């Protein structure tokens with residue numbers, strides 16, 4: 001019955017839709033439509049306290065649109081996703097974290113850094129570099145695989161814990 005507005009951010013192709021779908025529907029969709037943006041609602045129990053999740057899975061190319069800024073205003077927590085095999089996607093995290101801190105006007109915005117596709121063999125972003133970035137932000141870092149399910153509940157639930165702590 002308390003509702004959390006969550007926003008899933010990160011470059012195209014990192015797995016934002018595969019994570020969100022895995023969480024909601026419990027399976028891995030290979031090659032989900034790259035171009036669709038929507039919210040998904042789910043009722044979950046975390047640490048024994050029921051809540052409603054309202055999760056925006058962002059899509060589209062954007063030089064910073066007004067509609068995106070409106071959704072960032074509404075967001076209560078941000079899941080910032082990169083892919084461990086994609087150096088550019090990791091480089092983009094800086095930029096998301098700047099926008100988030102600007103829109104919310106705050107250094108202390110509930111956020112979790114998510115390194116997705118942890119099942120993949122050719123890792124290009126070092127775990128230690130992500131851990132260090134996360135630690136410098138003071139936010140949790142969780143490696144996930146939307147394909148394996150590894151980490152998926154933990155990423156979203158930890159973001160909820162971050163809202164609740166805050």
Ligand SMILES: Nc1nc2c(ncn2[C@@H]2O[C@H](COP(=O)(O)OP(=O)(O)O)[C@@H](O)[C@H]2O)c(=O)[nH]1
Pocket residue numbers: 010011012013014015016017018019029030031032033034116117118119120144145146147148
């Ligand atoms: N191996 C693997 N592939 C994934 C994973 N997550 C997403 N993908 C694939 O990577 C591509 C991008 O996923 P998508 O969910 O569309 O990412 P989005 O653009 O951020 O929404 C698709 O081909 C997915 O099947 C994962 O955890 N492991």
Ligand SMILES: Oc1ccccc1C(=S)N1CCCC1
Pocket residue numbers: 005006007038039040054055056070071072074075
């Ligand atoms: O549903 C949401 C979840 C997080 C942030 C914003 C929203 C809103 S109000 N949206 C309106 C329709 C698509 C997303």
Ligand SMILES: [Mg+2]
Pocket residue numbers: 016017018032033034035036057058059
């Ligand atoms: Mg998508």
